[PDB]
Design a protein around this ligand. Sequence first.
Ligand SMILES: [Zn+2]
Ligand SMILES: [Zn+2]
Ligand SMILES: [Zn+2]
Ligand SMILES: [Zn+2]
Ligand SMILES: [Zn+2]
Ligand SMILES: [Zn+2]
Ligand SMILES: [Zn+2]
Ligand SMILES: [Zn+2]
Ligand SMILES: [Zn+2]
Ligand SMILES: [Zn+2]
Ligand SMILES: [Zn+2]
Length: 423
Amino acid sequence: MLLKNCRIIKDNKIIEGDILIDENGRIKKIAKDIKVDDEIIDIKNSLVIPGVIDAHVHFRWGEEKKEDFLSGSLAGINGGVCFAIDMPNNKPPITTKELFYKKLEDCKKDSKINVFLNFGVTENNYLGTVEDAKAYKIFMVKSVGDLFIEDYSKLKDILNQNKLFCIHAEHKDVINENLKKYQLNSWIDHCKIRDEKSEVEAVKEVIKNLKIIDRQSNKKPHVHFCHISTKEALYLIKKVRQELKNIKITVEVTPHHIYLNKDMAEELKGFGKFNPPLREKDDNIALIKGIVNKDVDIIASDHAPHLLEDKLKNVKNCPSGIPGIETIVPLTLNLVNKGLISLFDAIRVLSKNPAKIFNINNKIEEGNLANLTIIDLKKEGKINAELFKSKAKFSPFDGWEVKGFPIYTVINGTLYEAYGCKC
Ligand SMILES: [Zn+2]
Ligand SMILES: [Zn+2]
Ligand SMILES: [Zn+2]
Ligand SMILES: [Zn+2]
Ligand SMILES: [Zn+2]
Ligand SMILES: [Zn+2]
Ligand SMILES: [Zn+2]
Ligand SMILES: [Zn+2]
Ligand SMILES: [Zn+2]
Ligand SMILES: [Zn+2]
Ligand SMILES: [Zn+2]
């Protein structure tokens, strides 16, 4: 198959050319005006970027009414996402090697995009190695089962390893304190119970332990902070990066923590309830500036589908989490069109930095498997949750008019239509 009239992001620049994909799905040739006897698809000078990686999804293994590998990967295709990294807080949680490989087999059977699995860290399993895991996920607060580090004094031992750790950083003790101070009456109370200090104190807890390791140890962990949402945590991470010599720290943010704030809590209801919760407009701004200043490394969705039925309950009964794999690319491109980040910033946080951090080769280079996101940068259109392929057909962004959509998703050489090629 020949994709003609592409504008390709290769290295630091936009080149015009055609992309020839052989029938093994590998890029065979990149050159202007290629002339071959093959199937030809005219890209009409749309932008071709290395396939987008969503480094933070929950595809709900064990809870397949919420989402499964098929609906999740169809959602990914629809969102222009070529690679997704799925978290281990399943029913049961992925805390043993056998559970990991039993989930990996189900994943291989029906996933239509490139899905990788993270391993769940407990106080009991933390020295184990799982060769096919992309990263080791630490929850500092209750998720499911024993997937929860309840004793923070063990964090130094857990982190003192040559491993890639992802961390959900909210402080259990701050949240417990706040639960004695506030009642969950309305949606804003969720934001007061899991307040900004609960995130900042969890980040401080981790950093304190990394400083010890950096000087007293030969181990070189890479620590990736999931969904950072506060200006103070970003500041602390910026500071400590200047002090650490052996330990790399990366930062991810979500679209909802960039766009939404707690003044919207009562209007968003269940669709605004997620962990960490809605913050202040000043935090939105800090995260956007953090992308421009390269303090924020990646954007990931924290795609967390639940049943619509449960998301319509009151604040006490409503589960935390929203779907987001189908809105992450348009919401990020929308920032480009509003002049808040540059096009190359968008590429860096959706495609290039996730590929470096998690060791995923999505490069548009001859000989590589073709994993491409093809976008129409200027297409204006409404987000319409009825057009989602996820089982979770709802969103706080439903009805938003944004500019910039994926139109095609290429998965290992196979061309699919994305959300924008029906918009
Ligand atoms: Zn072909
Ligand atoms: Zn022929
Ligand atoms: Zn299904
Ligand atoms: Zn999380
Ligand atoms: Zn690393
Ligand atoms: Zn310090
Ligand atoms: Zn704030
Ligand atoms: Zn998550
Ligand atoms: Zn229910
Ligand atoms: Zn119910
Ligand atoms: Zn308009």
